[PDB]
């Protein structure tokens, strides 16, 4: 690596080159760390994690027992080994704790002061990071598998909420109105996601093997309805254009926002184009999943070749997004993995499982 | 010096005795203290025995493993290297891989491995955080009754 | 000589006892003083059960000492 | 104010301190009236092991606020 | 009720128990921390084991959730520091006050009952060989209590 240092020093290669090459090297050498720990606080499994977007310091986690821990990943100690102490926690003793499993906790974008969560108690609560008090609560008529806030929108603050009804809900964290709904799906909505690039493009995955991108400004259906064979087996859109063969329960736009990775219960990933819904035929091999709710997964940022970290049974699988190769298989858990989140700042990966653990993977050397 | 070791381990495990016959176990202790690669050779012997289909043989292999664990430190590192498979073969956690017969020996294996894992968590848990992970996983995810 | 005992109700009462006296009579004195049955007392001195079949002199108890009274418990 | 530093045996050593004395002062005063040098004390006030740098006003020690003294035979 | 806890706190500050000490940890009077000095003539001699009391919202008529913070060796106390007294779960009595529950715990430190134990692994050692018990408890006290 001294070659990269000298090249950066004499201005040959842009500093971008060393930065990205070193980030890729670190992610390729990713391994579990016994030189770091995250305190065990959840009675049941961990369903979700979301490192804060700005400064990458705090870290929420939605336990399956309704407790929302709020970790602190900065090594405030002096020793090489440390444990990420849990700063706060919405314990069961809290008056407004979630009665059932918390399956999505997300920071309010552009404002770390607040964060949101939602649970099978058919509620979505807007939590205040400082005083830990519900700022706003929206009660739905049915459960809430997954919700997501636009990480790019400075204009609106709508919140797609995929209930187990066929209708996507849009909740407004400004003056409350959950009236706006997006009709067109046929079964439960297991995973939604806003477009990181465009303000108003929402991609919603369902359990009927359909992935649709909605222009929420448009109030006459969806822009696109993803189709496996790119229209080869052309059929009108009444029972066709199925992005999978079984339930599709996970979405993750690539970091640039140009491609919409989807993973479904048919045990395949597919890197769909995000502008016209044309499958790009990246193989990815066979990816194992059998979960019956929102499967979380994330994609690396600031690396030469974009990696994707998909929960694969009880192991994290690391694929290269644009080539489909399998980099490795991080292997440290005791039950199925429910959510892995990438710490972009230092190329660290935190993967909550169903065994109440949150294993923090870090690079070697 | 592998022939006598494979032999002695075979008479220890295949006998099916309720309790470890003492003097040949002491011979195993001495000759396992002799060399480190041969201690790990005994570890492979134990692992190969533990996969084989008989609850009494698995019990003998596990009790030897517990002896070496409480007696050796490099053995603790080596076994925590694959504690996941060790738990799959001892505790029968995976329904797709239960324990062989007989039922009495399997029950004794379950009780003995639960109590040995308790002792290991108390004695070597801090030095081996992966043992702590395994103990926690057994105590909540698998809900193993440690009070039984 | 006499001894102090701190009953359960916050009050404190003084017992006239001798070192040769056995603990059973001590509990009987607690009984006729306030009336909780000989079985239910569990006298504590320096965090020790005062065994029924023993005497104060066994436990190294002197004048102006104090005995603590609680409700009968058990292990778990 | 007066703090009475009662030990295990029940002996209730009297002490006097100003409201701002550092607890090392408290241990030193206990040394004079009881004889145990400050290294071997572990003063426990209301279920908090007092730390050797905190001022007495930190713990809200008032008149007649009983501490507890426990011997640490090693005591460095 | 608070007034019950207030009266307990005052009457404990005035006339403390001998080898016990409990007071609120901060502003919330419902969360006390206590301290059981190891009873004399026991393996726990010279020890200082810190509890952590939690009074419910109906404290007179409902037990407080006391739990050791200092890892104690005992058949009746798990490694997590939780106790299983009958007085504290089933036979709670309002007349029993915190100065009394702490003293009863102190007494039970020396009077375990391996029958129906919360930790059978230690209970077997206690029932079989008490000589080793008094050494393992001693080393745990020395490595946690002092």
């Amino acid at each position: 690596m001294l070659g990269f240092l000298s090249a950066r020093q004499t201005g040959l290669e842009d500093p971008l080159r060393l930065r990205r090459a070193e980030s890729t090297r670190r992610v390729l050498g990713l391994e579990l760390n016994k030189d770091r720990d995250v305190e065990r606080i959840h009675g049941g499994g961990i369903n979700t994690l979301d490192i804060e977007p700005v400064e990458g310091r705090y870290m929420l986690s939605g336990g399956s027992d309704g407790v929302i821990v709020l970790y602190d990943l900065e090594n405030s100690s002096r020793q090489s080994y440390y444990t990420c102490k849990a700063v706060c926690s919405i314990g069961r003793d809290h008056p407004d704790v979630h009665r059932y499993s918390v399956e999505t906790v997300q920071w309010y974008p552009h404002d770390t002061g607040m964060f949101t969560s939602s649970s099978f108690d058919k509620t979505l609560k807007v939590w205040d990071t400082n005083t830990l008090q519900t700022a706003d609560v929206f009660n739905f008529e049915e459960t809430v598998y997954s919700h997501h806030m636009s990480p790019v929108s400075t204009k609106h603050c709508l919140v797609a909420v995929g209930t187990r009804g066929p209708k996507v809900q849009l909740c407004d964290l400004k003056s409350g109105s959950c009236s706006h709904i997006l009709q067109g799906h046929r079964q439960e909505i297991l995973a939604v996601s806003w477009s990181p690039r465009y303000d108003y493009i929402l991609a919603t995955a369902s359990a009927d093997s359909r992935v649709k991108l909605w222009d929420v400004r448009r109030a006459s259906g969806c822009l696109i309805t993803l189709d496996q064979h790119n229209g080869k087996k052309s059929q009108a859109v009444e029972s066709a254009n199925t992005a999978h063969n079984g339930k599709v329960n996970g979405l993750c736009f690539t970091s640039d926002g140009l491609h919409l990775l989807t993973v479904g219960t048919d045990n395949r990933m597919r890197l769909w184009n995000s502008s016209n819904g044309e499958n790009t035929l990246v193989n990815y091999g066979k990816v194992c999943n059998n979960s019956k709710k929102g499967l979380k997964f994330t994609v690396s940022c600031g690396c030469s070749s974009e990696f994707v970290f998909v929960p694969y049974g009880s192991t994290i699988a690391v694929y290269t997004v644009y080539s489909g190769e399998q980099i490795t298989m991080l292997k440290g858990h005791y039950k199925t993995v429910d959510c892995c989140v990438f710490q972009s700042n230092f190329q660290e990966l935190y993967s909550g499982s169903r065994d109440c653990n949150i294993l923090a993977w870090v690079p070697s050397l | 010096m592998d022939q006598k070791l494979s032999k002695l381990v075979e008479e220890l495990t295949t006998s099916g005795e309720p309790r470890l016959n003492p003097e040949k176990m002491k011979e195993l202790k001495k000759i396992c203290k002799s060399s480190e690669e041969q201690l790990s050779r005994a570890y492979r012997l134990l692992i190969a025995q533990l996969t084989q289909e008989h609850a009494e043989i698995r019990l003998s292999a596990f009790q030897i493993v517990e002896e070496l664990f409480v007696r050796s430190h490099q053995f603790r590192m080596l076994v925590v290297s694959n504690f996941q498979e060790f738990l799959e073969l001892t505790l029968g956690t995976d329904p797709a891989q239960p324990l062989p017969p007989p039922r009495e020996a399997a029950q004794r294996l379950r009780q003995a491995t639960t109590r040995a894992v308790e002792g290991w968590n108390e004695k070597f848990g801090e030095a081996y955080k992966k043992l702590a992970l395994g103990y926690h996983f057994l105590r909540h995810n698998k809900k193993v009754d440690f009070q039984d | 000589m006499q001894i102090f005992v701190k009953t359960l109700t916050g009050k404190t009462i003084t017992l006239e006892v001798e070192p040769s006296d056995t603990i059973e009579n001590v509990k009987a004195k607690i009984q006729d003083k306030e009336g909780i049955p000989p079985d239910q007392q569990r006298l504590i001195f320096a965090g020790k059960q005062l065994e029924d079949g023993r005497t104060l002199s066994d436990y190294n108890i002197q004048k102006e000492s104090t005995l603590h009274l609680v409700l009968r418990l058990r292990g778990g | 104010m007066l703090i009475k530093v009662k030990t295990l045996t029940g002996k209730e050593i009297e002490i006097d301190i100003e409201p701002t004395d550092k607890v090392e002062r408290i241990k030193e005063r206990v040394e004079e009236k009881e004889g145990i040098p400050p290294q071997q004390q572990r003063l426990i006030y209301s279920g908090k092991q007092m730390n050797d740098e905190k001022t007495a006003a930190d713990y809200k020690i008032l008149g007649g606020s009983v501490l507890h003294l426990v011997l640490a035979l090693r005591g460095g | 009720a608070l007034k019950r806890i207030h009266k307990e706190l005052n009457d404990l500050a005035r006339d403390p128990p001998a080898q016990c000490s409990a007071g609120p940890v901060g502003d919330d009077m419902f969360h006390w921390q206590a301290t059981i000095m190891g009873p004399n003539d026991s393996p726990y001699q010279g020890g200082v084991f810190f509890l952590t009391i939690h009074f419910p919202t109906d404290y007179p008529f409902k037990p407080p959730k006391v739990a050791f913070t200092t890892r104690i060796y005992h058949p009746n106390i798990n490694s997590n520091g939780s106790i299983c007294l009958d007085i504290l779960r089933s036979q709670w009595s309002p007349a029993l006050t915190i100065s009394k529950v702490l003293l009863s715990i102190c007494s039970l430190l020396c009077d375990p009952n391996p029958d129906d134990p919360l930790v059978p692994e230690i209970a077997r050692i206690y029932k079989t060989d008490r000589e080793k018990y008094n050494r393992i408890a001693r080393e745990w006290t020395q490595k946690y209590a002092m």
Side-chain angles (χ1 to χ4, degrees), chain B residues 42-78:
Chain B
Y43 164 85
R44 276 89 68 189
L45 280 162
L46 294 168
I47 282 291
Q49 283 303 40
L50 285 152
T51 58
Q52 159 273 332
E53 304 177 345
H54 203 301
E56 289 163 62
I57 304 300
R58 268 178 208 224
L59 189 73
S60 74
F62 153 73
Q63 293 179 356
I64 298 164
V65 164
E66 184 175 1
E67 153 172 355
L68 282 72
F69 195 99
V70 179
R71 182 253 167 266
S72 296
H73 187 276
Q74 69 276 17
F75 194 76
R76 296 157 210 149
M77 293 183 286
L78 171 83

Side-chain angles (χ1 to χ4, degrees), chain A residues 106-111 114 116 124 126 136 138 147-161 169-178 180 194 199-200 202 216:
Chain A
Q106 160 163 5
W107 295 89
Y108 190 109
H110 307 327
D111 188 347
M114 283 73 74
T116 60
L124 175 138
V126 175
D136 290 330
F138 311 91
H147 88 296
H148 198 268
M149 259 188 275
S150 170
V152 62
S153 174
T154 68
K155 164 166 287 192
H156 67 75
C157 280
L158 290 172
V159 191
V161 173
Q169 298 296 112
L170 303 188
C171 288
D172 202 320
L173 307 187
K174 297 181 175 184
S175 172
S177 166
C178 50
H180 200 152
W194 291 91
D199 279 4
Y200 292 94
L202 168 60
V216 301

Side-chain angles (χ1 to χ4, degrees), chain A residues 42-47 62-67 99-103 338 354:
Chain A
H42 302 277
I46 295 89
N47 288 122
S64 57
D65 57 68
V67 68
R99 321 316 319 282
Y100 293 61
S101 159
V102 173
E103 293 179 353
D338 270 318
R354 275 195 173 89

Side-chain angles (χ1 to χ4, degrees), chain A residues 6 31 35 37 74 85 118 156 173 176 181-182 189 208 212 261 263 280 302:
Chain A
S6 81
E31 184 53 26
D35 195 75
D37 186 74
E74 279 166 355
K85 61 195 75 58
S118 66
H156 67 75
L173 307 187
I181 55 168
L182 310 166
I189 296 147
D208 60 332
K212 298 178 174 272
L261 276 160
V263 64
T280 63

Side-chain angles (χ1 to χ4, degrees), chain A residues 4-138:
Chain A
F4 288 143
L5 273 174
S6 81
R8 188 177 71 166
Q9 210 182 16
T10 77
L12 286 158
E13 303 180 10
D14 192 75
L16 171 143
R17 207 68 56 87
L18 190 148
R19 197 166 67 247
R20 306 265 274 286
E22 188 61 19
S23 291
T24 286
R25 261 193 64 256
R26 289 191 77 209
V27 164
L28 285 192
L30 206 58
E31 184 53 26
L32 192 142
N33 201 19
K34 295 304 311 191
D35 195 75
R36 185 187 316 217
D37 186 74
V38 187
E39 286 199 357
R40 310 185 69 193
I41 288 168
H42 302 277
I46 295 89
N47 288 122
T48 182
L49 308 168
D50 189 358
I51 294 171
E52 64 163 9
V54 305
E55 302 255 349
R57 170 167 195 196
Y58 301 121
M59 191 205 158
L60 292 152
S61 63
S64 57
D65 57 68
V67 68
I68 288 161
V69 176
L70 195 152
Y71 298 101
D72 185 74
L73 307 171
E74 279 166 355
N75 172 20
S76 161
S77 68
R78 272 83 177 285
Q79 298 80 18
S80 287
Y81 172 79
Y82 79 112
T83 73
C84 315
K85 61 195 75 58
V87 164
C88 291
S89 62
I90 313 311
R92 295 173 201 166
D93 63 344
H94 208 270
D96 304 342
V97 71
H98 279 288
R99 321 316 319 282
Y100 293 61
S101 159
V102 173
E103 293 179 353
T104 61
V105 305
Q106 160 163 5
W107 295 89
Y108 190 109
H110 307 327
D111 188 347
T112 67
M114 283 73 74
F115 74 101
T116 60
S117 68
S118 66
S119 296
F120 287 170
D121 66 343
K122 309 189 279 290
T123 308
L124 175 138
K125 307 178 191 278
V126 175
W127 293 100
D128 183 356
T129 310
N130 189 359
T131 67
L132 305 157
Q133 192 176 359
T134 58
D136 290 330
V137 301
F138 311 91

